[PDB]
Amino acid sequence: GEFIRTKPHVNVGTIGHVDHGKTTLTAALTFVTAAENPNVEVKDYGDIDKAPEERARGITINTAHVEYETAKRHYSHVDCPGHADYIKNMITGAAQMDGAILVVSAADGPMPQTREHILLARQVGVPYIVVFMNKVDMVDDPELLDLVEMEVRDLLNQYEFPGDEVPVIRGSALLALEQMHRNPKTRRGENEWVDKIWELLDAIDEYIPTPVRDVDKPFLMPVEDVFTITGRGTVATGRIERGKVKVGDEVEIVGLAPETRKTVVTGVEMHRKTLQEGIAGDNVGVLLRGVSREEVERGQVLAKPGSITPHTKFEASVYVLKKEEGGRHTGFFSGYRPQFYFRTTDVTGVVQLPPGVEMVMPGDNVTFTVELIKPVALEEGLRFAIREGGRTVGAGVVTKILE
Numbered sequence: 246g247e248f249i250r251t252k253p254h255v256n257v258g259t260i261g262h263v264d265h266g267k268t269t270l271t272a273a274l275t276f277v278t279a280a281e282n283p284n285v286e287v288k289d290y291g292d293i294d295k296a297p298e299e300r301a302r303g304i305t306i307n308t309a310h311v312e313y314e315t316a317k318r319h320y321s322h323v324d325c326p327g328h329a330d331y332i333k334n335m336i337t338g339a340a341q342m343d344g345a346i347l348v349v350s351a352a353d354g355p356m357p358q359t360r361e362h363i364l365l366a367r368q369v370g371v372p373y374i375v376v377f378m379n380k381v382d383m384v385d386d387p388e389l390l391d392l393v394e395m396e397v398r399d400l401l402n403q404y405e406f407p408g409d410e411v412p413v414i415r416g417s418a419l420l421a422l423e424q425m426h427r428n429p430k431t432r433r434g435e436n437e438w439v440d441k442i443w444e445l446l447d448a449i450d451e452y453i454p455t456p457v458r459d460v461d462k463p464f465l466m467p468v469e470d471v472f473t474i475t476g477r478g479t480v481a482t483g484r485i486e487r488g489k490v491k492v493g494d495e496v497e498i499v500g501l502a503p504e505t506r507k508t509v510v511t512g513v514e515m516h517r518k519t520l521q522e523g524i525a526g527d528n529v530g531v532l533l534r535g536v537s538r539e540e541v542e543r544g545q546v547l548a549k550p551g552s553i554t555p556h557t558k559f560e561a562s563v564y565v566l567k568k569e570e571g572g573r574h575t576g577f578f579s580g581y582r583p584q585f586y587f588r589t590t591d592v593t594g595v596v597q598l599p600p601g602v603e604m605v606m607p608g609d610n611v612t613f614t615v616e617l618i619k620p621v622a623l624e625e626g627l628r629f630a631i632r633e634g635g636r637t638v639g640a641g642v643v644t645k646i647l648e
């Protein structure tokens with residue numbers, strides 16, 4: 246079918262520690278809203294964690310995109326992995342978010358990736374956060390629930406989110422999900438668990454503002470994934486950052502390659518629905534003519550031809566995490582070669598310290614030069630994260646492009 250715009254569109258998603266309930270909540274959101282809006286397509290647990298490797302490991306590995314809507318807005322929701330081995334996919338998912346739903350297990354409280362996800366969500370531009378305290382069906386001590394809530398707000402404050410003001414809904418994604426299976430038509434007010442899901446939706450509706458979109462700037466879309474649609478071609482997916490794109494437009498594939506590739510857009514879809522035009526904010530699949538899935542990849546960006554120039558060298562202001570925040574135990578030197586994350590791009594870079602600065606310690610606030618091993622679309626003021634050896638080691642901002 247063709248996508249019909251009738252209400253504002255917002256991109257949300259789920260982040261949080263492994264096993265805290267992100268995928269269960271995601272499925273519940275689709276079932277709950279579907280009872281009220283026939284246009285919503287239901288997605289059960291196994292329809293989201295559907296890949297063979299996910300069934301093999303028993304965890305989410307790939308980001309999943311599901312759609313649902315309330316009376317007020319239309320939502321694209323990205324469900325991310327909580328396992329530490331897949332932090333890379335979580336970052337790519339967060340880069341598509343206008344707001345995030347932080348899931349925390351009431352039974353376990355804040356764990357290492359609860360903190361790491363909050364820190365990373367910020368560095369990729371997530372402005373707002375709503376908390377769903379999950380698994381309360383397992384905690385009878387009210388004091389504990391109040392304690393976890395306090396801990397979570399404290400954590401958010403540590404990373405510059407308004408911890409004291411964020412809505413914190415307490416519920417059970419699983420019990421809400423079970424109820425909807427028993428009665429798919431369950432409406433608001435009928436069941437306790439389902440009502441808590443409605444509470445979350447109301448908070449999303451009202452707390453996360455609809456972003457100001459720039460549909461008049463040159464088209465720019467960070468690529469999050471790429472695949473082949475047999476008999477149709479190569480599709481690049483991602484959230485349009487600014488501008489618009491129409492079937493027939495020419496776009497440039499920028500970054501990660503020595504040279505830039507140009508091709509024509511032959512299709513645009515949002516959630517398998519046809520669009521004549523994709524605009525800033527939409528989460529879409531863009532069909533590209535004449536390129537194979539080995540010619541486009543995650544981390545590159547599609548852009549209006551000639552509007553972007555990929556760079557490799559820049560100066561940056563950086564905060565280096567302390568051991569206590571999951572950071573490094575020891576300092577590093579000039580020549581350190583960690584991974585840098587900008588939006589959906591992940592690239593190796595070489596740290597070059599200025600003379601007189603020969604070492605950087607955890608907890609330090611420094612400025613230094615970074616030289617990337619591959620060209621990528623960059624801009625001054627662009628935030629980024631630094632990871633190395635399975636941990637996030639720093640967060641920074643690009644202050645000046647050098648080349």
Ligand SMILES: Nc1nc2c(ncn2[C@@H]2O[C@H](COP(=O)(O)OP(=O)(O)NP(=O)(O)O)[C@@H](O)[C@H]2O)c(=O)[nH]1
Pocket residue numbers: 261262263264265266267268269270303304305325326327328379380381382383416417418419420
């Ligand atoms: N008791 C209880 N268990 C729950 C609840 N929500 C989820 N679970 C369970 O806890 C486990 C993890 O749930 P899941 O949704 O896959 O977690 P996730 O946060 O998406 N994990 P990952 O980080 O791999 O993506 C499952 O066994 C699931 O049934 C809940 O409200 N109550």
Ligand SMILES: [Mg+2]
Pocket residue numbers: 267268269294304305325326327
């Ligand atoms: Mg999951």
